[PDB]
């Protein structure tokens, strides 16, 4: 028992982190087989970052302009290419610690673990949910670019995120491992705003089931609701509509607690309308939407 | 650059996790050099755990009764001994992945990362603070015993916790790596209660310093207090008294903000006596007590 925000063990990803330097710009890279993946803005100087013409900047670079360090061992760059916002550096040595891996693009509302790194050295690990507005609420400082997000399923690491930016609001933005940004962001030194965020409803419901499984029941009620009537109220409060697929995904948690999905919806409707009146759920004063049904099932099953 | 609960990268500890089995009883162990450390209750059947006499149960065991596996690979046991609530099994192979390490006994309020393991396979990593009542608010299921808690300073892993128990209230209890329980708990299949918990004052102060560093400082008042007067007031609000070590570990945050420790204590005292009055600190209506002064430095710098 107990319920805590938990990240995947980071060992398999730590063995892939390297430092990439070009001129006076330094960030992290991901070394898989004989290729190092990193944010392309490493080729920029402080003047270039304002309005970078990346294809022009890249053609002017040679392999010797890239310094790649794996611990206290320099890797020789023997080739380079660009795929959207990601730079790929071919090195003359293969990473013996390369795990089994895939590159995937995660969907909004899903979670992943972030291994925050500085100068190619792993610093910390935490969970993030990809918000509906395609930002993440992380903790990244200067030098964190190139840090990656991932999920692990049976010894296979699925990489889904590479860090590139911190918006003026304090949230973060990045790309998948094909170099495509999540959201309407661009890799230039400009203040960028995200679209209006919304709350991940299916995750709030999963978290309320985790609370019941762990002993918090004060918010339950004898009311019930239809799916549409719940969705009308959820949209009024800027929550995403709950689909029948989301209802089905909550099935195991409903079976475990004996609380029908629509009865938990009735509870959530009452919490949105009346507030929490100074009370807490799982020690939080706010409704939490960063746990998926899978994240809850992983800690509550049995 | 926001504030998140962050675990240490777990790789150095993942390379030390093994499974230990006696009969049909299985749990996790920690393999460092040629020794594996694990909870001594691995020598019990389910019925033996109700009322165990560990010394009598162990005299009946030989090295050949212990199965230690790193995945499916067996590590032959060549010596065994019990130290408090831990069993130490000497194995015939030195772990090539052994990091630089130390065994430490932490204080209440100190935080650490837990690598939750099942069958010797790491499944998740999360941060825990040792509560003043010597429990942790972890997430542990059947098979988690022997999972460890640690801190990482530079490249040295300081192991501080080994998991053994889940209390009726859902919180967790365990030992240090020398097998001494934190708190009054014993390793037997019995319902045990922890003492009344208190709020970790030094950590609340660290979180107020973190708010100030981020420009959130509405709560700073123009008063000061003595340490003794503050401790007496804090205890009326179920807050832990500060020690000289707590004042010293707040030193760097006090120097960074220019707010003396006792002036921050006077500000916290007013928050306790008057409340938050609908206001938030770092986007929270509650005072947070699970970030240490090092956790604040670690994330801000
Ligand atoms: C990388 O480490 C750079 O290599 C860095 C990560 C952030 C630094 C602080 N916390 C972080 O997450 N990213 C950047 O510095 C990027 C670089 C771009 C993609 C070329 N820039 C920003 O994140 C950035 C620029 C501006 C800005 O300008 C003007 C105005 C407001 C916000 C802002 N963020
Ligand atoms: C270990 O994995 C056992 O090897 C296990 C970890 C807990 C199981 C569920 N989550 C956990 O954290 N620990 C136990 O099962 C221990 C065994 C002791 C050390 C011999 N027992 C308990 O945690 C325990 C027993 C009882 C109890 O009895 C009767 C009544 C109430 C609570 C309770 N906890």
From Swiss-Prot, chain A:
Compartment list: Host cytoplasm; Host Golgi apparatus; Host nucleus
Cytoplasmic side: 1-302
All residue ranges annotated as the Peptidase C30 domain in the record: 1-302
Outcome of substituting residue 205 to V: In strain: Zeta/P.2
Description of activity control: Inhibited by pyridone-containing alpha-ketoamides compounds 13a and 13b. In turn, alpha-ketoamide 13b (tert-butyl (1-((S)-1-(((S)-4-(benzylamino)-3,4-dioxo-1-((S)-2-oxopyrrolidin-3-yl)butan-2-yl)amino)-3-cyclopropyl-1-oxopropan-2-yl)-2-oxo-1,2-dihydropyridin-3-yl)carbamate) inhibits SARS-CoV-2 replication in human lung cells. Inhibited ex vivo by michael acceptor inhibitor N3. Inhibited ex vivo by compound 11a and 11b.
Effect ascribed to mutating residue 142 to A: Does not affect ability to cleave and inactivate human TRMT1
Result after altering residue 132 to H: In strain: Omicron/BA.1, Omicron/BA.2, Omicron/BA.2.12.1, Omicron/BA.2.75, Omicron/BA.4, Omicron/BA.5, Omicron/BQ.1.1, Omicron/XBB.1.5, Omicron/EG.5.1
Coiled-coil segments: none
Active-site residues, record numbering mapped to chain: 41 (for 3cl-pro activity), 145 (nucleophile)
Catalytic activity: TSAVLQ-|-SGFRK-NH2 and SGVTFQ-|-GKFKK the two peptides corresponding to the two self-cleavage sites of the SARS 3C-like proteinase are the two most reactive peptide substrates. The enzyme exhibits a strong preference for substrates containing Gln at P1 position and Leu at P2 position
Covalent cross-link Glycyl lysine isopeptide (Lys-Gly) (interchain with G-Cter in ubiquitin), where: 5, 90
Cited function: Cleaves the C-terminus of replicase polyprotein at 11 sites. Recognizes substrates containing the core sequence [ILMVF]-Q-|-[SGACN]. Cleaves and inactivates human TRMT1, preventing tRNA guanine(26)-dimethylation of tRNAs. May cleave human NLRP1 in lung epithelial cells, thereby activating the NLRP1 inflammasome pathway. May cleave human GSDMD, triggering alternative GSDME-mediated epithelial cell death upon activation of the NLRP1 inflammasome, which may enhance the release interleukins 1B, 6, 16 and 18. Also able to bind an ADP-ribose-1''-phosphate (ADRP).
Known partners and oligomeric status: 3CL-PRO exists as monomer and homodimer. Only the homodimer shows catalytic activity. Interacts with host FBXO22; this interaction promotes the proteasomal degradation of nsp5.
UniProt protein name: 3C-like proteinase nsp5
Organism: Severe acute respiratory syndrome coronavirus 2
Upper taxonomic lineage: Viruses, Riboviria, Orthornavirae, Pisuviricota, Pisoniviricetes
Name of the gene this protein is made from: rep
